[PDB]
């Protein structure tokens, strides 16, 4: 599947010889579906057909093609379900951009200094966004947002203070010029998160109200991707966006729309841990809101959800366990996004002891 166009490559030749082969298992955490680290068979004998979880597990455990090398990329949260299959791994952590590299990114992204310098200053002046631009995705989103602002020549202002604000900002400048189909896109994302789907067929888009005409709008206004690498699988340009859209779904106005149930399944591989779904849900549930898509978000629901979110924090903050869902600092990220002192202070009163790293 991952080889040259020839459907019958030399699988039975040197391709069977281990130690000269390295696998790149990119996105362990994106393996949609339950992943059982404890299985019956260990699918030895590569030619034997078996389920994907078993096949991957067998490769991961070095039972399939033993002595072969294996590189795995993953979100650190998913290590909970991966560390049981590594035995003797070398763990490498990926760190974001340093101040020097943030600067290089901006100058490489923009066509010339005339705009790159403006972009750099506009962001550098914003302590929060500059710090957030630690992440390649965030600086990309901000740069893309600026590029769109440059095309219109409106202002290039970048005043966002949260992760949510960046994502909301990005859509505001993208969909406002669409607004009538945002619900369908949000529904699609929510369905995907709950039904363990990242890659969508055109049939799935149509079934959520997005058929060709609006879908193309998202492909043009870099929001949503088609996967045209000899395929026809639509998806969000990044998993963080899919989680963002799912989060908005719960707050608009078909999995359930029950946030309590959503939260109950937070600390689980099956749903992708819902880390950004909740982080965004918190940022979105606010009173300090404005227009441009935000006004289409349900205020009445936000008030109903806010209460349950506060209860959720109290219940989880109470836990003193390690390698558990929101390990203190994660709750702080949620509260950081929801920049409203009334809520945050009430929530923080449930943290008599703070243990963070």
Partner 1 sequence: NQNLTHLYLRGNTLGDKGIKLLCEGLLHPDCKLQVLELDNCNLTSHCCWDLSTLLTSSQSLRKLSLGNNDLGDLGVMMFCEVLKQQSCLLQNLGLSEMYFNYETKSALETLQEEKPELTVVFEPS
Residues binding partner 1 (CB under 8 A): 10, 12-14
| CA 252 – CA 280 distance, rounded (Å) | 14
Smallest distance from partner 1 to CB 47, Å: 12
Tokens of 55: 């096949």
Which of 13/91 has CB closer to partner 1? 13
Which of 10/27 has CB closer to partner 1? 10
Which of 45/288 has CB closer to partner 1? 45
Residue 273's nearest CA partner among 200, 219, 340, 323 is 323
Smallest distance from partner 1 to CB 68, Å: 17
| CA 170 – CA 238 distance, rounded (Å) | 13
Which residues are within 8 A (CB) of 18 and not within 5 positions of it... i.e. 6 or more apart? Answer: 65, 66, 67, 68
Q: Output b/e per residue, 138-154; b: 16+ Cβ within 10 A.
A: bbebbbbbbbbbbeeee
Residue 259's nearest CA partner among 271, 270, 247, 267 is 247
| CA 111 – CA 90 distance, rounded (Å) | 39
Smallest distance from partner 1 to CB 195, Å: 41
Q: How is 108-167 classified by DSSP, letter by letter? A: HHSSSHHHHHHHHHHHHTSHHHHHHTTSHHHHHHHHHHHHHHHHHTS-------SHHHHH
| CA 241 – CA 164 distance, rounded (Å) | 10
Smallest distance from partner 1 to CB 13, Å: 5
Smallest distance from partner 1 to CB 17, Å: 8
The owner of tokens 């990329």 is: 73
Smallest distance from partner 1 to CB 70, Å: 23
Which of 46/253 has CB closer to partner 1? 46
The reply, when asked if residue 238 is annotated as ligand binding, is: yes
Which of 1/14 has CB closer to partner 1? 14
Which of 13/38 has CB closer to partner 1? 13
Residues making up the binding site for ATP: 238
Residues making up the binding site: 238
């Amino acid at each position: 599947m991952s080889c040259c166009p020839d459907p019958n490559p030399p699988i039975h030749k040197i391709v069977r010889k281990p130690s000269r082969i390295l696998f790149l298992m990119d996105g362990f955490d994106e393996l949609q579906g339950a992943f059982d680290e404890h299985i019956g068979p260990l699918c030895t004998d590569w030619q034997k057909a078996e389920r994907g979880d078993i096949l991957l597990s067998s490769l991961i455990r070095k039972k399939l093609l033993p002595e072969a090398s294996l590189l795995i990329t993953t979100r650190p949260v998913a290590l909970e379900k991966l560390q049981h299959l590594l035995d003797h791994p070398r763990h490498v952590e990926i760190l974001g951009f340093s101040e020097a590299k943030r600067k290089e990114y901006f100058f490489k992204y923009f066509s010339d200094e005339a705009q790159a310098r403006a972009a750099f200053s506009l962001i550098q002046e914003n302590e929060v966004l500059f710090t957030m631009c630690f992440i390649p995705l965030v600086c990309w989103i901000v740069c893309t947002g600026l590029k769109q602002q440059m095309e219109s020549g409106k202002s290039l202002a970048q005043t966002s203070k949260t992760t949510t604000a960046v994502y909301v900002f990005f859509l505001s400048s993208l969909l406002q010029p669409l607004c009538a189909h945002l619900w369908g896109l949000c529904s699609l994302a929510a369905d995907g998160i709950w039904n363990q789907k990242i890659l969508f067929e055109e049939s799935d888009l149509r079934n959520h109200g997005l058929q060709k005409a609006d879908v193309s709008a998202f492909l043009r206004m870099n929001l949503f991707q088609k996967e045209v690498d000899c395929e026809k699988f639509y998806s969000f340009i990044h998993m963080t966006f899919q989680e963002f859209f799912a989060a908005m779904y719960y707050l608009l106005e078909l999995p359930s729309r029950d946030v309590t149930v959503l939260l109950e399944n937070y600390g689980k591989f099956e749903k992708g841990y819902l880390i950004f779904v909740v982080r965004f849900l918190f940022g979105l549930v606010n009173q300090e809101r404005t227009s441009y898509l935000e006004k289409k978000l349900s205020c009445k629901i936000s008030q109903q959800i806010r209460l349950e979110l506060l209860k959720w924090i109290e219940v989880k903050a109470k836990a003193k366990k390690l390698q558990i869902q929101p390990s203190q600092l994660e709750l702080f990220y949620c509260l950081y996004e929801m920049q409203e002192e009334d809520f945050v202070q009430r929530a923080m009163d449930y943290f008599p002891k703070i243990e963070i790293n």
